[PDB]
Amino acid sequence: KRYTITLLPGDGIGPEVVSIAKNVLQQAGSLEGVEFNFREMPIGGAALDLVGVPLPEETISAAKESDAVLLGAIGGYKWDNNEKHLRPEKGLLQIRAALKVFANLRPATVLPQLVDASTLKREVAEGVDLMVVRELTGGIYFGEPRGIKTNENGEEVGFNTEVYAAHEIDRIARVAFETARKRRGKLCSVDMANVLEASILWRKRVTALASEYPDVELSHMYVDNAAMQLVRDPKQFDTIVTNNIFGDILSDEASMITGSIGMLPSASLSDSGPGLFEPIHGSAPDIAGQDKANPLATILSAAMLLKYGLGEEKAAKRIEDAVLVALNNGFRTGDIYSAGTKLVGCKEMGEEVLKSVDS
Amino acid sequence: KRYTITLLPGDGIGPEVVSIAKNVLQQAGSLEGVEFNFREMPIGGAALDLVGVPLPEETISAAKESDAVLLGAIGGYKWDNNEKHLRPEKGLLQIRAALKVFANLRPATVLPQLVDASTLKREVAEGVDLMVVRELTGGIYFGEPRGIKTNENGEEVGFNTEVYAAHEIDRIARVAFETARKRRGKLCSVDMANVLEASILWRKRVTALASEYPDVELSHMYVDNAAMQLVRDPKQFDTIVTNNIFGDILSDEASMITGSIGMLPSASLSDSGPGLFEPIHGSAPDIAGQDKANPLATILSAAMLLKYGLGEEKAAKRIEDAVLVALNNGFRTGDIYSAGTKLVGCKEMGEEVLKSVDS
Ligand SMILES: [Mg+2]
Ligand SMILES: [Mg+2]
C-alpha cells in the first residue's frame, strides 16, 4: 500500500521528465490504493556540482533502502572534460554495481501510432515487440586483465578480457526466463558459441536451466545472425538474453529499428533489492528548460517500475493505457511529431497522460 | 596479360557458381587483352572427402603461388558432426591465415533493380553503397589466453581475450584508407574506445595514420552507434574500418539491410600476395545441382578479384556492367525474384551475363 521511491532527477531534461513521471506514478498508484514516499537524491553532473562526485554514498544508501529507483538522465557538456572517475557516467556505472542490478531489460516495441517513424517498411515494423535482457554488470567491459602494454620491442599491445563465471550467467538467464513468462513464453539466448569459449559456457549454462523453466520455449542464436534477424524479421522475437557487450549492441540496434528513441523505457533488476528504472534516451542538454522533452519514455519507465519493480500490474497497465490514449488523441512532442498530429510541449504531453489516468 | 588463378570450387553450390564466374572472368578479361591460367584445388568438404583434411598443403601452395584465388562456398551436412579441426570451415580459417589476408572487404550495395528486397523503406535503402573493411585474422576470435577453467569454488569460468598489437591495427587501417581512395574518400573507424583499452589503442593508431592519408576524410564512431546508424541512415557511410568481431557483426547487419544476400561479393586482401575472393552466401546444400543458385555474387567476386586483386579496373567494370544489364533485362534467380520479372535458373542467368559481356 505504501512504497518508498528514490528519485534521481539527474541532468539536462532529467529533472523535467522525472517530475512528470512522479505525478503519473502517484495518480496511477492512487487508483489502485497505492501510495508513495518520494526522496530526490543527487547523481551525475548534479551530484558533481553539489557534492563533488558523480555518486555520493548518501544516494547509494537511499537507493538501497528504497523499494525502487527512478532515474532521469545523466550527462552534460560541463563535465565532459573531467577525469574519467569524475564524469557523470561513472555515477551510473557505480549505482548499478552498488544495487547489484545485473539484469538490464529494454523493451523495443513499435507503437501503432508511431509505426511510420521506423525506417523499416510498415509491414515489417508494425507489431514489433521484443525484450532484450542484457547482462549489465559483468563481461568484457569490466573484465580483467586489461590494458595497453609495451611488449618486448617498441610496440604497444591493447587487450581486454571477456569473462563470465557460471553463477553470473545463471542469474541473468533466470531473470530472462522469468521475464519470458511475463510476456509470450519465448526466449532466444544469443552468443558466439561457435568461436568463443565464454559463449560456449554461456550456452551450456542457459541450456542446463531450460529444464527448470520447461514452460518457456528456448532457442539459441549467434550474435551476427541476431543482428541480421532484427533487420529482416524483428517480429520473430519475444525475449532475448545475452551478455553485456552483445546486449549493448543488439538492444541499440533494436531501439533504432522501432524508430522512436524518445519512447523507450528500461529496467535494471537485481536478485532481491530495489530495481533501477530509466529512459534510455540521454540528458538532451540542448533542449533542457525549453519544455520540448518527450516525457513518455520516463513515464513508461515508471510503468516498468510498477510492474517489474513492485509487482503492481494493474497500476502499471493504467499508465501504459493512458500513454496510448494521449497518442490516440494525436498529441506528439517534437521528436515524434508527424503531419496531422498535435505538436505539444513536455508539460502539455504530461498533462494529457494525467487526464487519461484520472479519467 | 596472363595471370594465374587458383579456383576453389568447394561445396554445395560452390562448383556451380565458380564455373560460371570463371567463364565471365575469362570473357571480360579477354576484351582487355588479359588471359588466365586456372587451376582447381580442393578445400572444405570436398577436400575432406578427397584428401581427408579441410585444407591440404598442395592447396595452400597453389594459392600462394598464384596471382589471385577465387573461392566458391564451404560447408555441408555430411561433415557437421566432424571434430572441430576437421570441419570444412576450418579450411577457410586456415587458408586466410596462410595467405595472410588480414583485410576483409565486404561491399554492401543496394542495386536499383533490387531495392524492394530490403526491409528498409525505399527512400532509405535506395543508394546504399558502403564498404566494411574488417580485420580478418586477429582479435578475440584468435586471442590468447582463452578457455573454460574451474576456479577456487569448483565453478567454471569462461574467458576470451580481445587483443591487438599496434602493427596489426596499422595494416588493416592502411588498407581501409587505400580502399576509401578507390571509393568516395570517406572512412569511418568504428570501435568501443569509450570503454575498451584495445579500442583506445585502435583509435590511437588510426588517428595517427590520418596525416599520411590527408586526402581521406576520417571520422570515428562507437560500435553500438554504428549498429543504429546502419538502420537509420546507411547512405551516410562510404568505407568503414573496424576489428574482427565488430566487423563480423556490423557487416552482417549491413548485408541484411541490402536485402539480397545472394548478390553480395567479398575480397580478402594481404600486404603483397594473392587475394582471396568469395561470395558471402553459404554453400546452400539444399539447392545444389538443382540449377537454382544465384551466380551473381560469385561473378561480382570475380569483379573484385580483377579490381582489388589484380588492378584490372576496366575488366572489372565490364563484369559489373554486364550484371546490371542482366538485371535491367528482367532476369532473376529465385532468391531475387519479384512479380513482373523473369524467373531463371543459374545457368541461364550466367548465360545472360555472358551475352552482355560479349557485346
Ligand atoms: Mg549502447
Ligand atoms: Mg558473420
UniProtKB/Swiss-Prot annotation, chains A, B:
Residue positions binding substrate: 96, 106, 134, 224
Chloroplast found in the keyword field: yes
Effect of residue 96 to K: Reduced activity toward 3-isopropylmalate
Record GO biological process: embryo sac development; L-leucine biosynthetic process; pollen development
Signal peptide (from-to): none
Effect of residue 248 to N: Loss of activity toward 3-isopropylmalate
EC number annotated for this UniProt entry: 1.1.1.85
Function, as annotated: Involved in leucine biosynthesis; catalyzes the oxidative decarboxylation step in leucine biosynthesis (primary metabolism). Catalyzes the oxidation of 3-carboxy-2-hydroxy-4-methylpentanoate (3-isopropylmalate, 3-IPM) to 3-carboxy-4-methyl-2-oxopentanoate. The product decarboxylates to 4-methyl-2 oxopentanoate. Required during pollen development and involved in embryo sac development.
Family: Belongs to the isocitrate and isopropylmalate dehydrogenases family.
Record's protein name: 3-isopropylmalate dehydrogenase 2, chloroplastic
Biological classification of the source: Eukaryota, Viridiplantae, Streptophyta, Embryophyta, Tracheophyta
